[PDB]
Design a protein around this ligand. Structure first.
Ligand code: A1JGI
Ligand code: A1JGI
Ligand code: NA
Lengths: 301, 302
């Protein structure tokens, strides 16, 4: 019993974190096989950051302009290339701690673990979701760029995020490991702003299912809803639309608890209307949207 | 910016987790140097769990009755003994991944990371506090026993918890690594219940300081208070008493933010008295008590 925001064990990722230095800038890189991945903005100076021409900045660099430090050891850079918004530094040693891995681009609503790192050394691990507005609500200080997000379903690490920047509202933006940004963001210091965020409806429902599995039914009611009426109400509280895909995805949790998906939708409508009236659900006084259907099955009996 | 419930990186502890099997029971052990530590209840069957005589159950076991698996390798047990409520299995190989470590006993209110494991295979990590009633609000299924809690204080892992049981309210009880229970619990199937819990006041204040650092200031006010008046308020709301030591510990955060501790106590008094009036603090509608002052400084400063 219990329900916690639970991260993956971080050791497989810790063994891959290095420090990348270019000029006066130091940040984190990810060392897999004989390649070090890091944000391309490492090559920017103070001037550059508003309108950097990365191709022009990079052509001016040699291999030995990049200092890569893995623990106490310097790695030798023997090649470099840029792919989208990541720098790939080819090094002369394959990382002996390279885990089985892959690169996956995730969708909004997906969760992952972040290993926050400074100077190539891990500081902490926490669980995040990709928000509907393509930001993450992380915890990051200066020097954290190049920290990564991952899942480890099985023994295979799926890298899905690399940290590039903090927006003015204090939320975070980054790329997949192919260097493509999530959302409309760019790696420039121009004024850009996250869109209005919404609540991840399918995850809230998943979490209501978790509460039922863990023995709590107080918030259920005798009613049902059509999918369309559910969406008409939920969007008035800035909830994401629920799609038939989402309904299908919740089918296993529906079967385990004996509560139909649109019946749970009816419960959610009433919760939005009434609030909790001094009660909690799995120890929360708010409706939690950073647990996916898959996370609930992973964690719950 | 941002403030998350954050665990220590778990890699140093992952390299020490093994599977211990005795009869039909499989659970997790901690392999350090040439000893594997696990809950002594591993030697019990269901009937034994009712009224175990551990000494008597153990004398009947041979070394080879304990199957210890580190990944895909079986370790050979060459000795076994008990210390309080933990079994110590001496094995023929020192763990080459043994980190620098100590065994430390923590106090209620202190936080730590838990590496939850099943069949000696780490599955997740989360951050816990030791509650004033000596339980933890963990997340554990059958097979989780022997999962461990820890802090890292440099390159040194301080092991502070090993999981033994779930209580009827769905909270968790366990020992330090010397096998001494936290709380008035025993390792047997009998009627056991957590005492009524309280809120960890010094931690709530720490978290209010985190909120201010991150730009959430709506709850600050022009008032201050005294320790004695505030403590009358804490007691009324089932908060732990705040001591001078607590005030001293929060001194750095007071200096950084310009909010004295008793000034922040005046904020907290008003929150307890009036509620939050629809608003949140760091995304929470309740007052969070599982960050220590040290946790806030560690996360907010480096
Ligand atoms: C370098 N930048 C950070 O936000 C870096 N960072 N990340 N998390 C951060 C958290 C706190 C402070 C800084 C943080 C920005 C910036 N505005 O300067 C930037 C400029 C140019 C190209 C970039 F891709 C990013
Ligand atoms: C083995 N026990 C668990 O609670 C084990 N466990 N831990 N977290 C648990 C979470 C879910 C289910 C079981 C869980 C009990 C029991 N009832 O048999 C017990 C027996 C003997 C000595 C003990 F200290 C406790
Ligand atoms: Na005040």
């Amino acid at each position: 019993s219990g329900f916690r925001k639970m991260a993956f064990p971080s050791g497989k990722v810790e063994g891959c974190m290095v420090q990348v230095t270019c000029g006066t800038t130091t940040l984190n890189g990810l060392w897999l096989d004989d390649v070090v991945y890091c944000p391309r903005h490492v090559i920017c100076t103070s001037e550059d950051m508003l309108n950097p021409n990365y191709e022009d900045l990079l052509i001016r660099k040699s291999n030995h302009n990049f200092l890569v430090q893995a623990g106490n050891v310097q790695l030798r850079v023997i090649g470099h290339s840029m792919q989208n918004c990541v720098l790939k530094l080819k090094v002369d040693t394959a990382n002996p701690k390279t885990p089985k891995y892959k690169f996956v681009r995730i969708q909004p609503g997906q969760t992952f673990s972040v290993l926050a790192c400074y100077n190539g050394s891990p500081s902490g691990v926490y669980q995040c979701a990709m928000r509907p507005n393509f930001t993450i609500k992380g915890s990051f200080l200066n020097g954290s760029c190049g920290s990564v997000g991952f899942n480890i379903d099985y023994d295979c690490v799926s890298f899905c995020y690399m940290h590039h920047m903090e927006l003015p509202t204090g939320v975070h933006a980054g790329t997949d490991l192919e260097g493509n940004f999530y959302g409309p963001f760019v790696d420039r210091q121009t004024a850009q702003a996250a869109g209005t965020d919404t609540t991840i409806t399918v995850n809230v429902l998943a979490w209501l299912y978790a509460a039922v599995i863990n023995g709590d039914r107080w918030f259920l009611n005798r009613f049902t809803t059509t999918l369309n009426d559910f969406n008409l109400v939920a969007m008035k509280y800035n909830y994401e639309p629920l799609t038939q895909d989402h309904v299908d995805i919740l089918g296993p949790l529906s079967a385990q608890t004996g509560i139909a998906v649109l019946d749970m939708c009816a419960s959610l409508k009433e919760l939005l209307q009434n609030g909790m009236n001094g009660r909690t659900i799995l120890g929360s006084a708010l409706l939690e949207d950073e647990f996916t259907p898959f996370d609930v099955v992973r964690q719950c009996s």
